[PDB]
Design a protein around this ligand. Structure first.
Ligand SMILES: CCCCCCCCCCCCCCCCCC(=O)OC[C@H](COP(=O)([O-])OCC(O)COP(=O)([O-])OC[C@@H](COC(=O)CCCCCCCCCCCCCCCCC)OC(=O)CCCCCCCCCCCCCCCCC)OC(=O)CCCCCCCCCCCCCCCCC
Ligand SMILES: CCCCCCCCCCCCCCCCCC(=O)OC[C@H](COP(=O)([O-])OCC(O)COP(=O)([O-])OC[C@@H](COC(=O)CCCCCCCCCCCCCCCCC)OC(=O)CCCCCCCCCCCCCCCCC)OC(=O)CCCCCCCCCCCCCCCCC
Ligand SMILES: CCCCCCCCCCCCCCCCC[C@@H](O)O[C@H](CO[C@H](O)CCCCCCCCCCCCCCC)COP(=O)(O)OCC[N+](C)(C)C
Ligand SMILES: CCCCCCCCCCCCCCCCC[C@@H](O)O[C@H](CO[C@H](O)CCCCCCCCCCCCCCC)COP(=O)(O)OCC[N+](C)(C)C
Ligand SMILES: CCCCCCCC/C=C\CCCCCCCC(=O)OC[C@H](COP(=O)(O)OCCN)OC(=O)CCCCCCC/C=C\CCCCCCCC
Ligand SMILES: CCCCCCCC/C=C\CCCCCCCC(=O)OC[C@H](COP(=O)(O)OCCN)OC(=O)CCCCCCC/C=C\CCCCCCCC
Ligand SMILES: CCCCCCCC/C=C\CCCCCCCC(=O)OC[C@H](COP(=O)(O)OCCN)OC(=O)CCCCCCC/C=C\CCCCCCCC
Ligand SMILES: CCCCCCCC/C=C\CCCCCCCC(=O)O[C@H](COC(=O)CCCCCCC/C=C/CCCCCCCC)COP(=O)(O)OCCN
Lengths: 459, 64, 175, 54, 329, 56, 121, 53, 104
C-alpha cells in the first residue's frame, strides 16, 4: 500500500518546491498519475482480502472508495484554480497542502487494519477540512459552520474511542481480521446496549442521521468548492464504511437497536426530499439531497443483508460522483452571478447550452435513471427493505417520486424559462469547466458497464 | 435578499416556545416516527410468528 | 457444440417438420433466406475461417485450478486462528460453487420454459422439481446468515436445525 | 423546513448545549476577586472533605 | 444461419447509427432529418423479414447475448424476447415513425433546432424498442424510464414556455406514481421467484398473488393514463404535433397496456386483479369520451380519444383477451 | 537545455521516485511475512529441482 | 506495571548493563528516520521564525538539528526496547512460577461447541 | 485505465466456480445423488450435547 | 451593498417601528401588515395577499416577465409556491365547493 502512500506524500515537497505558476499543472498531473496507480487496487479476490502488511489491508469495499478519493483531488484542483487567482503563492501552496493532507489521511483511513489507527486517521481528517472551511470560505457564517462541523463530530466520536479501548481490554485485540474471526454474540444487557450506542453514534453523526444532520447544510454551503466536493464525495462515506466494518461485533443486538435509526432514516428521507422542494439556495438543496441519499444508505447498512450491503456500496460511490458534479455546476453558476440564489439567474439554457446538457445529465443521475449505478444501489436497497418488511415500499416510492420532482425542479428553475434581463455578465463556459464536468460524468456512465467493481465484498 | 434572509436566517432569533409551536413541533416531529415504528413492529412480529409456526411458504426465497 | 457439456445442459433431440408446400406459389421466406445466406453467411464464414487459421498458427493452453481439501470449521480448536482461516476460505469457495450450481439449474429451467412453448406447464415438471429440491437445500444451508456470514454461523445454524430434527424424531418415537 | 429543521432540531441539541455552557461559564468565572470568599469556600470544602470520607 | 436472430437484432442496432453520427458533420448540415428518416425506413423494411418468418412458421426466440452482473444465485443478462408481440409491434412502430419523420420534415421546417428534434425522435424510438423486446424486468424498466425521459424532453420542447415545462413535470410526476408500483412488482418478483427473467417468473407462479399484479396494474395505469392518473396525457399536447402524434398517441402510451399483455400468463390466474383492470378501463374510457365530446382544441379532442381507446384496451385485458388488445394497439 | 531546465523541472521527478520507493518498501515488508511460505495445507508444494522459494 | 521498586534497579542509569544483551536498533530504523524528520522540521521552523530562506538558510544548523535528534532518538529507542523486554521477561517468569493461577484450557473443537444461532431477517 | 480494468484477470474465480459446479453437477447427476445436500457439514463429525430431559 | 438596517428584523410592537418596517419594505404604512406574533420565526416581514403569480396582470411590462415581478417590490413569503409552474389560486368559473361536490 506504500506504493500509493509515498507518492501522495511526495506531492507536498513537489508542491512547495514548484514555480509560482506551475503549482496547478504539477499537482494535477501527479495527482492524476497517483489515481492511475491506485486504479490497480480494483483487482480484488473472492477470498478474504488484500492483506499487504500488519498495518494496511485492502478490500473490495475499500478499493472503490480509495479510487474515488484519488480521483477527486485533480477535480478539486481544477475547481479551485479559478477563485484562488488573486491570492499569494504561499497561501495557494497551503491550500494545495491541505488538500494533499486530506487525501493522505483518507487513503490511510480506508486501509487501516487497526480500529484505533482507523479512529486516529478518521479524526485526523477533521483538521484539514476545518481549516479549509474557516480560512477560504466567503461568508461570515463559515466560522459558525466550522464550529458545528467540529463539535457534532467529536460529540459522536469521543464515546467511540472509549468503547474501542474497552473492547481491546476484553477481546485483547482490535485488528479487524481477528475481530471478524473471533466475533461473539452480544447479550441483551444495558452495558451492551450502551456499547452498541457508543459504537454506532460516531458513524451515525457523519452520514448524517436525520436528527443529527444540522451541521451538514451549514458546512457544505459555507465551504469553498473543493471543500464541498470533498465533504459530499468522500467524507460522508466514512460513516458508512465505519458502520459496515463495526456491525460485525454488534450482532445480534442490532436486531433490536436498529429500530429507532431505521424509523429516523425512513421518515427523514421523506422529510429532506420534501425540504428540497422549498429551497431558495442551490447548495442547500444539494446538501439536503445528500442527506436523503445517506438516509437510504443508513437503512441499507442497518438491515445488514447481502443485497443491502451491495446496494449501499454502489449508492455511496454513485452519490459521491453525482453530488460532486452538482456542486461543481452550482459553483460555475455562482462564479458568474455571485449570488447562490436559485431564482436569480434563469433561462441559462439559451446562453450556455453545453452547460445545460451537463445540468441535465447530472439531474438524470441524481434522479436515479436506469441503468445508472445510482439506480442499481437504489433498487438493491429497496428490494432488501421489501424483504425486511413489505410496507417500506410506500416510503421508498414516495422518496423516489419526490427526488425526481426536486431534481427536475432544480433543472427547470435554473436552465429553462426566460433569461434574466439585467444580468449581462454571463460569459461563455471555459474549457476548464467543461473538462471538469466530463471528468465527473464519464466515470459514472462507464462504471455502469462493470458494476461488480463497486458492489462491495458480498458480490 | 430580504426574502431569502427572512426565509433562512431570520427564523430562529424570532422563535418563541409557544403552546402552538410546542404542540406542532412535538406532533409533526415525533408522531410519524412512533406511528411508523408501531406499523413496522407489528408487521415484523406477525412475520416472525408466522415463520415460527412455519406457515409462511418461503419457498424459492433465496436472495435477501 | 463441444464448447459445453451436453449432460450438464441437456436438450431434447430437436424434432423439426418437413416443408409440405400445398400450393405452387413461391413463398418469399425461402428465396429471402437463400439470399441472406449468400450475402451474409458466406462472408462471415470465410472471415471465421481466416481467424481460426490464424488462431491455429498460435496454440497455447490455460488450466483449471485444483484446490486441495483442508479440515473444516468442525475440526478446529476454539481459538486456533490458522485452521479457522483455512476452513473459512474453504467454506467460502464451497458457497460460491453452490451458488453456481443453483445458477445452472435455473438456466435449465429458463431454457425449458422458452423451449416447450405453449405446453411448458406440463413439459417442464422435471426442471421445476429439480429446482425445488436444489432451492430447498440451498435455503437450508444459507438462508438467514445475513451480512457478516461465516462458517461458524453456518455450523451453528446446522446444529440448531439438527437438534430440532432430533427432538422431533424423539417425540415421534415416544408418541 | 422551519418548525423541525430550523427551530426544534436546533433548539434540542446545539442551542441547549450552548445555553447551558454559557450559564455555567458565567456562574463559574464570576468571582469579584475577594480572597475572603475564596478562603471561606476553602474552609467549607476542607470541612466537608474531612467529614464525608471518614 | 437461421437469420431470425441476426435480423431482429440488426433492426434495433441500425436504429442507433444516426445517434452515433450525431457528433459527425452530417448533424451540422440540413441533410440530417432525411438521413434519420431513411435509416428508419430501412429498419422497417428489414424488420419485415422476421414478421414473414414468424407468420410462416411461428418462430420464437430468446436471445441472451451479453451477460451483465451476476448477483449470487441471480444472473442478469442482456436478453431480448422475440415473440409474436415484439415481431408484430416493431414493424408497426417503425412504419408509424417513418411517416412521423416524413411529416416532421415539413411541419418543423422553420425550427432552428430540427436536427436535434429528429435526434430526440430517434432516441424515443430506440427506448421504445428496448421496452418492447425486453426479456427481463430490469431491461424493461430501462425502456420504461427512457421513454418517460424522452417524453419529458419532447413535451418541453419550447423551454421558454412556462406551460410546456409544467406539463413535462406533470407527466414525470404521474409516471413516477406508476413507477412506485413497477418497483414494488420488481422487488416482489426478485424476493419470491428469485428472478427478473420472464421464463422463471412464469414457471414459478402457477397462482400469482395480489401484490405483484397490483403493482403491474398501477404501473400500467400510470403509463397509459388511466382514470386515477389520466390528466397528464391531455396536458402533454403542449409539445409539437409530431411529438403528440408519435409518443402520446400511438406508441408510448400503449406501453402500460403492453406490460399487462406481457404478463398475461399471471393475470389469468388471478380473479380480483382482472376485475380491477376491467373497472379501471371502463371508467377511464367513459370519462375520457365524456370529456372529449365537448372540447374545442382539436389536439385535446384527439388526446381524449386516445385515452378512451387505451381504456378500451385495458377493458379487453380485464376480460382476459390479451391478444385482442394487442391487435387493437 | 540541459543543466538549465533541470533547475526548473527538478521537482517533477520526485513523485515517480516515491512510487518506486513505495514498491521497494512493499516488497521489503513482504519479506518479513514468510513464516508460512510453502507451509499452508492448501498449497503444500514440493519444490522444483531448481527452485528456492515458492513465491517472493 | 510499576517497575520503580523492581529489585536490583540502580537509581539513575539510563541503560543498565543487562540491556546490552538485547539487539541494538538498526540505524535505518523507521523510528530513527522519524526522529531525523522531526529534527529537519525543527530546523525549517527555526528558519521560518527568524525570517530566513526556510529551505536553504543554515545547512550547518539544520544538520545539527537532525544529528542531535537522531542521537537522542537512538538512545531513547534502546531504553524503550529494554523496558519492554523487562516487562515481557517478568510476565513470563510470573506465569511460570504460578501455574495454579494460569491453568491450561482444555482444547475443544467447534464440532462439539454449541453456539446459539441468530438469524438475520 | 478503463481498458486495464476491463481486462483484469479473474481473481474473483467466477469461471473457476462455474467449472467446479459443472463437473460436480455432472458427477452427481450421473450417480443419482440428490444434487445439493441440505447439510453443509457431515453430521458424523459433529458432537451434539445429549439433553436427557 | 445592503446595510444592516435594510434586513428583516423582529416583530414590530409600536407604530413608530411599524412605520420603519413599512418604509424598509417599500410599501405604505396602511398596507403593511406583519404575520401574527406567534412562535413561528416570521418576525418583521409583510404578509402579502395569498394570491398566486399566475393571476397577476400578464399585459403589464414586468421587469421579470416570466415571474411577473418588479425589481424593488416586496416578495411574497411563498413566492416559490406560486410561480406559474405550481399551485395557482386563480378564480374559476365554478365555485370550489361546487366542483368538489360534483367531482366527489
Ligand atoms: C440510445 C443508443 C445510443 C447509441 C449511440 C452511442 C451514444 C454514446 C453516448 C455516450 C454518453 C454520452 C456522453 C454524455 C455527455 C454528452 C456529450 C455532449 O455534450 O454531446 C455533444 C454532441 C454534439 O452536440 P452539440 O450540438 O455540439 O451540443 C448541443 C447541446 O449540447 C444540446 O445537445 P442535445 O440536446 O442533443 O443533448 C445531448 C444528449 C447527450 O447528453 C446526455 O444526456 C447523455 C447521457 C444520458 C444518460 C444519463 C444518465 C442515466 C444513466 C444511463 C447510463 C447509460 C450508459 C451505458 C454505458 C455507456 C458507456 C460509457 O442528451 C440527450 O439527447 C438526451 C437523451 C436521453 C437518453 C435517456 C435514455 C437512457 C437509457 C438508454 C439505454 C441505455 C442502456 C441500453 C440497454 C439495452 C440496449 C443495449 O452531441 C452528441 O453527440 C449526443 C450524445 C449522444 C446521445 C446520448 C443518448 C443515448 C446514449 C446513452 C449512453 C450510451 C448507450 C449505450 C448503449 C448502446 C447500444
Ligand atoms: C502526515 C505526515 C506527512 C506530512 C508532514 C506534514 C508536516 C511537514 C512539515 C512540518 C513543518 C516543516 C515546515 C514548517 C516551517 C514553515 C515554512 C513556511 O512557512 O513555508 C514557507 C516556505 C516557502 O516560502 P519562502 O519563500 O521560503 O519564505 C516565505 C515565508 O517563509 C512564508 O511566507 P509568509 O510568512 O509571508 O506567508 C504567510 C503564511 C506563512 O505561514 C505558514 O505557512 C506557516 C506554515 C504552517 C505552520 C506549520 C506548523 C508545524 C507543522 C505541523 C503540521 C501538522 C500536520 C498534522 C495534520 C493537521 C494539518 C494542520 O501564513 C499565512 O498565510 C496564514 C494563513 C494560512 C491559513 C492557516 C494556516 C494553516 C496551517 C496548517 C499547515 C499544515 C501543513 C504545512 C505544510 C508545510 C508548510 C511549508 O515553505 C517551504 O519551502 C518549506 C516546505 C518544506 C520543504 C521541503 C524540502 C524537501 C524537498 C526536496 C527533498 C525531497 C524529499 C524526499 C527525498 C527523496 C528525493 C529524491
Ligand atoms: C458522440 C456520439 C457517439 C459516438 C461514439 C459511438 C460508439 C459508442 C460505443 C460506446 C458505448 C456503447 C456501450 C457498448 C460497450 C462496449 C464495451 C463493453 O462491452 O466492454 C466493457 C468493458 O469495460 C469495462 O468493463 C468498464 C470500464 C471500467 C471503468 C473504470 C473507470 C476509469 C477510471 C477513472 C477514475 C475512477 C472515478 C470513479 C471512482 C469509482 C464490458 O465488457 P465485459 O463483458 O464486462 O468484459 C470485458 C472483456 N473480457 C471478457 C475480456 C473480460
Ligand atoms: C435526536 C436526534 C437523533 C439522535 C439519535 C437517536 C437514537 C437513540 C435511541 C436509543 C436506542 C434505544 C435505547 C434503549 C432501547 C432498549 C429497549 C427499550 O426501549 O424497551 C423497553 C425498555 O424499558 C424502558 O425503556 C426502561 C428504560 C426507561 C428510561 C429510558 C428513558 C425514556 C426516554 C428517553 C429518550 C431520550 C434519548 C436522548 C437522551 C439524551 C423494554 O423493557 P425490558 O424488556 O424490561 O428491558 C430491555 C433491556 N434489557 C433487556 C437490557 C434489560
Ligand atoms: C458537561 C460539559 C459538556 C461539554 C460539552 C461541550 C460541547 C461543545 C460546545 C460547547 C459550547 C460552549 C460555548 C458557548 O456555548 O458559548 C455560546 C456561544 C457564544 O458565541 P461566542 O463564540 O462565544 O462569541 C462570538 C461572538 N461574540 O455560542 C456559539 O457560538 C455556539 C456555536 C457553536 C455551537 C456548536 C454546537 C455543538 C453541539 C452539538 C450537539 C452535541 C453537543 C455535545 C454534547 C453531546 C451530548 C452528550
Ligand atoms: C465494432 C466493430 C468491430 C467488429 C469486430 C468484433 C466482432 C464481434 C466479436 C466480439 C468478441 C466477443 C465478445 O465481445 O466477448 C464477449 C463480450 C462479453 O464479455 P464476456 O466476458 O464474454 O461475458 C460478459 C461478462 N463477463 O461481449 C461484448 O462485450 C460485446 C457485445 C456486448 C453486448 C452489447 C452491450 C451494449 C449495452 C451496454 C451495456 C448497457 C448497460 C447494461 C444493461 C443491463 C441490462 C440487464
Ligand atoms: C400522490 C401525490 C401526492 C401529492 C404530490 C404533491 C406534489 C407537490 C409538488 C408538485 C410541483 C408543483 C406542480 O406540480 O404544479 C401543479 C401542476 C401544474 O398544474 P396545471 O393544472 O398543469 O396548470 C397548468 C396551467 N397553469 O400540476 C400537477 O402536476 C399536479 C399533480 C398532482 C397529482 C395529485 C393527484 C394524484 C392522485 C392519483 C390517485 C389515483 C392513483 C391511480 C390509481 C391506479 C389504479 C390501478
Ligand atoms: C451527537 C451527540 C451524541 C453524544 C454521544 C452519544 C452516544 C452515547 C453512548 C454512551 C456514551 C458512553 C458509553 C460507554 C462506552 C462503552 C463502554 C461500555 O460499553 O462499557 C459498559 C459501561 O456502560 C456504561 O457505563 C454506560 C454509562 C453511560 C453514562 C453516560 C450517559 C450519556 C447519556 C445517556 C443517555 C443517552 C444515551 C444514547 C444517546 C445517543 C446520542 C443522542 C459496560 O462495562 P462494565 O460496566 O465495566 O461491565 C459491566 C459490569 N460492571
Amino acid at each position: 500500500m506504500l506504493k500509493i502512500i509515498i507518492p501522495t506524500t511526495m506531492l507536498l515537497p513537489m508542491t512547495w518546491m514548484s514555480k509560482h505558476n506551475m503549482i496547478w499543472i504539477n499537482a494535477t498531473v501527479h495527482s492524476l498519475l497517483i489515481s492511475l496507480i491506485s486504479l490497480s487496487l480494483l483487482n480484488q479476490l473472492g477470498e478474504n482480502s488484500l492483506n499487504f502488511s500488519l498495518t494496511f489491508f485492502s478490500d473490495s469495499l475499500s478499493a472503490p472508495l480509495l479510487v474515488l478519493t484519488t480521483w477527486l483531488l485533480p477535480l478539486m484542483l481544477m475547481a479551485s484554480q479559478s477563485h484562488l487567482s488573486k491570492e499569494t503563492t504561499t497561501r495557494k501552496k497551503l491550500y494545495i497542502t491541505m488538500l494533499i493532507l486530506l487525501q493522505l489521511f483518507l487513503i490511510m483511513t480506508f486501509t487501516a487494519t487497526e480500529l484505533i489507527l482507523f479512529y486516529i486517521l478518521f479524526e485526523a481528517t477533521l483538521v484539514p477540512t476545518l481549516i479549509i472551511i474557516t480560512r477560504w470560505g466567503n461568508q461570515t457564517e463559515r466560522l459558525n459552520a466550522g464550529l458545528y462541523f467540529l463539535f457534532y463530530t467529536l460529540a459522536g466520536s469521543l464515546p467511540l474511542l472509549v468503547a474501542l479501548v474497552y473492547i481491546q481490554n476484553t477481546t485483547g485485540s482490535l485488528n479487524f481480521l481477528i475481530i471478524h474471526y473471533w466475533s461473539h454474540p452480544l447479550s441483551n444487557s444495558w452495558s451492551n446496549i450502551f456499547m452498541w450506542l457508543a459504537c454506532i453514534m460516531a458513524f451515525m453523526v457523519k452520514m448524517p442521521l436525520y436528527g443529527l444532520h444540522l451541521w451538514l447544510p451549514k458546512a457544505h454551503v459555507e465551504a469553498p468548492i473543493a471543500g464541498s466536493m470533498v465533504l459530499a464525495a468522500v467524507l460522508l462515506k466514512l460513516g458508512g464504511y465505519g458502520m459496515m466494518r463495526i456491525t460485525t461485533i454488534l450482532n445480534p443486538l442490532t436486531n433490536y437497536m436498529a429500530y429507532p435509526f431505521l424509523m429516523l432514516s425512513m421518515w427523514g428521507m421523506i422529510m429532506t426530499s420534501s425540504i428540497c422542494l422549498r429551497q431558495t439556495d442551490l447548495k442547500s438543496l444539494i446538501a439536503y439531497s445528500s442527506v436523503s441519499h445517506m438516509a437510504l444508505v443508513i437503512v441499507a447498512i442497518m438491515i445488514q443483508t447481502p443485497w443491502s450491503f451491495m446496494g449501499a456500496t454502489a449508492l455511496m460511490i454513485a452519490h459521491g460522483l453525482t453530488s460532486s458534479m452538482l456542486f461543481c455546476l452550482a459553483n460555475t453558476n455562482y462564479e458568474r452571478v455571485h449570488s447562490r440564489t436559485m431564482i436569480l439567474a434563469r433561462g441559462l439554457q439559451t446562453l450556455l447550452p453545453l452547460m445545460a446538457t451537463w445540468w441535465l445529465v447530472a439531474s438524470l443521475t441524481n434522479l436515479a435513471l436506469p441503468p445508472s449505478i445510482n439506480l442499481i444501489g437504489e433498487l438493491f436497497i429497496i428490494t432488501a427493505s421489501f424483504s425486511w418488511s413489505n410496507i417500506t415500499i410506500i416510503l421508498m416510492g414516495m422518496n423516489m417520486m419526490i427526488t425526481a420532482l426536486y431534481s427536475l425542479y432544480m433543472l427547470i428553475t435554473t436552465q429553462r424559462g426566460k433569461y434574466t434581463h439585467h444580468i449581462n455578465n454571463i460569459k461563455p463556459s471555459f474549457t476548464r469547466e467543461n473538462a471538469l464536468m466530463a471528468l465527473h460524468i464519464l466515470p459514472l456512465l462507464l462504471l455502469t458497464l462493470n458494476p461488480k467493481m463497486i458492489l462491495g465484498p458480498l458480490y | 435578499i430580504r426574502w431569502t434572509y427572512a426565509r433562512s436566517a431570520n427564523i430562529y432569533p424570532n422563535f418563541r416556545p409557544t403552546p402552538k409551536t410546542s404542540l406542532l413541533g412535538a406532533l409533526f416531529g415525533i408522531g410519524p416516527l412512533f406511528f411508523w415504528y408501531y406499523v413496522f413492529k407489528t408487521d415484523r412480529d406477525k412475520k416472525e410468528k408466522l415463520i415460527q409456526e412455519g406457515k409462511l411458504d418461503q419457498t424459492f426465497n433465496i436472495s435477501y | 457444440p463441444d464448447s459445453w457439456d451436453k449432460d450438464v445442459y441437456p436438450e431434447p433431440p430437436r424434432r423439426t417438420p418437413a416443408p409440405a408446400p400445398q400450393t405452387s406459389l413461391p413463398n418469399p421466406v425461402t428465396y429471402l433466406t437463400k439470399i441472406f445466406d449468400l450475402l451474409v453467411d458466406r462472408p462471415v464464414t470465410l472471415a471465421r475461417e481466416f481467424i481460426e487459421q490464424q488462431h491455429a498458427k498460435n496454440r497455447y493452453y490455460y488450466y483449471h485450478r485444483e484446490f486441495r481439501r483442508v479440515p473444516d470449521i468442525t475440526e478446529c480448536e476454539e481459538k486456533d486462528i490458522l485452521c479457522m482461516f483455512e476452513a473459512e476460505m474453504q467454506w467460502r469457495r464451497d458457497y460460491k460453487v453452490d451458488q453456481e450450481i443453483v445458477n445452472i439449474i435455473q438456466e435449465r429451467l429458463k431454457a425449458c420454459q422458452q423451449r416447450e412453448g405453449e405446453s411448458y406447464r406440463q413439459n417442464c415438471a422435471k426442471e421445476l422439481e429439480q429446482f425445488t429440491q436444489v432451492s430447498k437445500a440451498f435455503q437450508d444451508r444459507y438462508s438467514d446468515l445475513g451480512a457478516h456470514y461465516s462458517a461458524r454461523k453456518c455450523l451453528a445454524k446446522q446444529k440448531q436445525r439438527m437438534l430440532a430434527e432430533r427432538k422431533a424424531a424423539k417425540e415421534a418415537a415416544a408418541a | 423546513s422551519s418548525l423541525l429543521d430550523l427551530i426544534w432540531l436546533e433548539t434540542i441539541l446545539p442551542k441547549t448545549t450552548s445555553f447551558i455552557q454559557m450559564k455555567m461559564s458565567i456562574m463559574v468565572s464570576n468571582q469579584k476577586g475577594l480572597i475572603k470568599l475564596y478562603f471561606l469556600s476553602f474552609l467549607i470544602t476542607i470541612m466537608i472533605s474531612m467529614t464525608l470520607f471518614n | 444461419m437461421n437469420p431470425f436472430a441476426s435480423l431482429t437484432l440488426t433492426t434495433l442496432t441500425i436504429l442507433t447509427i444516426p445517434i452515433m453520427m450525431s457528433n459527425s458533420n452530417i448533424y451540422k448540415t440540413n441533410l440530417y432529418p432525411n438521413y434519420v428518416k431513411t435509416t428508419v425506413s430501412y429498419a422497417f423494411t428489414l424488420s419485415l423479414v422476421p414478421l414473414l418468418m414468424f407468420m410462416h412458421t411461428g418462430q420464437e426466440m430468446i436471445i441472451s447475448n451479453w451477460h451483465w452482473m451476476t448477483l449470487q444465485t441471480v444472473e442478469l443478462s442482456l436478453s431480448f424476447k422475440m415473440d409474436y408481440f415484439s415481431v408484430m409491434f416493431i414493424p408497426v412502430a417503425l412504419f408509424v415513425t417513418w411517416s412521423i419523420m416524413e411529416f416532421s420534415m415539413w411541419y418543423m421546417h422553420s425550427d432552428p433546432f430540427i436536427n436535434r428534434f429528429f435526434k430526440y425522435l430517434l432516441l424515443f424510438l430506440i427506448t421504445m424498442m428496448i421496452l418492447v423486446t425486453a426479456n427481463n424486468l430490469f431491461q424493461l424498466f430501462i425502456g420504461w424510464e427512457g421513454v418517460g425521459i424522452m417524453s419529458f424532453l419532447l413535451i418541453g420542447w419550447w423551454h421558454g414556455r412556462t406551460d410546456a415545462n409544467t406539463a413535462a413535470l406533470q407527466a414525470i410526476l404521474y409516471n413516477r406514481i406508476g413507477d412506485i408500483g413497477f418497483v414494488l412488482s420488481m422487488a416482489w418478483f426478485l424476493t419470491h421467484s428469485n428472478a427478473w427473467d420472464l421464463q422463471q417468473i412464469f414457471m414459478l407462479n402457477n397462482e400469482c398473488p395480489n401484490m405483484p399484479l397490483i403493482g403491474l396494474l398501477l404501473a400500467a395505469a400510470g403509463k397509459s393514463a388511466q382514470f386515477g392518473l389520466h390528466p397528464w396525457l391531455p396536458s402533454a399536447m403542449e409539445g409539437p404535433t409530431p411529438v403528440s402524434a408519435l409518443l402520446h398517441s400511438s406508441t408510448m402510451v400503449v406501453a402500460g397496456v403492453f406490460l399487462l399483455i406481457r404478463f398475461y400468463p399471471l393475470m389469468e390466474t388471478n380473479k380480483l386483479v382482472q376485475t380491477m383492470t376491467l373497472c379501471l378501463g371502463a371508467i377511464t374510457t367513459l370519462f375520457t369520451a365524456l370529456c372529449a365530446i365537448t372540447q374545442n382544441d382539436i389536439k385535446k379532442i384527439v388526446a381524449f380519444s386516445t385515452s378512451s381507446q387505451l381504456g378500451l384496451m385495458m377493458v379487453t385485458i380485464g376480460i382476459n383477451q390479451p391478444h385482442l388488445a394487442f391487435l387493437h394497439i | 537545455n540541459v543543466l538549465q531546465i533541470v533547475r526548473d523541472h527538478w521537482v517533477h521527478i520526485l513523485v515517480p521516485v516515491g512510487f518506486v520507493f513505495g514498491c521497494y518498501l512493499d516488497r521489503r515488508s513482504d519479506e518479513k511475512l514468510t513464516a508460512f511460505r510453502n507451509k499452508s495445507l492448501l498449497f503444500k508444494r514440493e519444490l522444483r529441482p531448481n527452485e528456492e522459494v515458492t513465491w517472493k | 506495571t510499576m517497575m520503580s521498586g523492581r529489585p536490583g534497579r540502580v537509581p539513575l542509569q539510563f541503560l543498565p548493563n543487562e540491556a546490552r544483551s538485547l539487539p541494538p536498533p538498526k540505524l535505518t530504523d523507521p523510528r530513527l528516520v522519524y526522529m531525523g524528520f522531526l529534527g529537519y522540521c525543527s530546523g525549517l521552523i527555526d528558519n521560518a521564525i527568524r525570517r530566513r530562506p526556510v529551505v536553504s538558510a543554515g545547512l550547518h544548523r539544520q544538520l545539527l538539528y537532525v544529528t542531535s535528534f537522531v542521537f537522542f532518538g537512538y538512545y531513547l529507542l534502546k531504553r524503550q526496547d529494554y523496558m519492554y523486554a523487562l516487562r515481557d521477561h517478568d510476565m513470563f517468569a510470573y506465569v511460570k512460577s504460578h501455574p495454579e493461577d494460569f491453568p491450561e484450557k482444555d482444547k475443544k473443537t467447534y464440532g462439539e461447541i454449541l453456539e446459539e444461532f441468530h438469524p438475520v431477517r | 485505465g478503463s481498458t486495464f480494468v476491463a481486462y483484469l484477470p479473474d481473481y474473483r474465480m467466477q469461471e473457476w466456480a462455474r467449472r467446479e459446479a459443472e463437473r460436480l453437477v455432472k458427477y452427481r447427476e450421473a450417480n443419482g445423488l440428490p444434487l445439493m445436500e441440505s447439510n453443509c457439514f457431515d453430521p458424523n463429525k459433529i458432537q451434539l450435547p445429549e439433553d436427557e430431559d | 451593498h445592503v446595510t444592516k438596517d435594510m434586513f428583516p428584523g423582529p416583530y414590530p410592537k409600536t407604530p413608530e417601528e411599524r412605520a420603519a418596517a413599512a418604509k424598509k419594505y417599500n410599501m405604505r404604512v396602511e398596507d403593511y401588515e406583519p404575520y401574527p406574533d406567534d412562535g413561528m420565526g416570521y418576525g418583521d416581514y409583510p404578509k402579502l395577499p395569498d394570491r398566486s403569480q399566475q393571476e397577476r396582470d400578464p399585459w403589464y411590462d414586468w421587469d421579470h416577465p416570466d415571474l411577473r415581478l418588479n425589481w424593488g417590490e416586496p416578495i411574497h413569503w411563498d413566492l416559490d409556491m406560486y410561480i406559474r409552474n405550481r399551485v395557482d389560486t386563480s378564480p374559476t368559473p365554478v365555485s370550489w365547493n361546487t366542483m368538489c361536490k360534483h367531482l366527489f
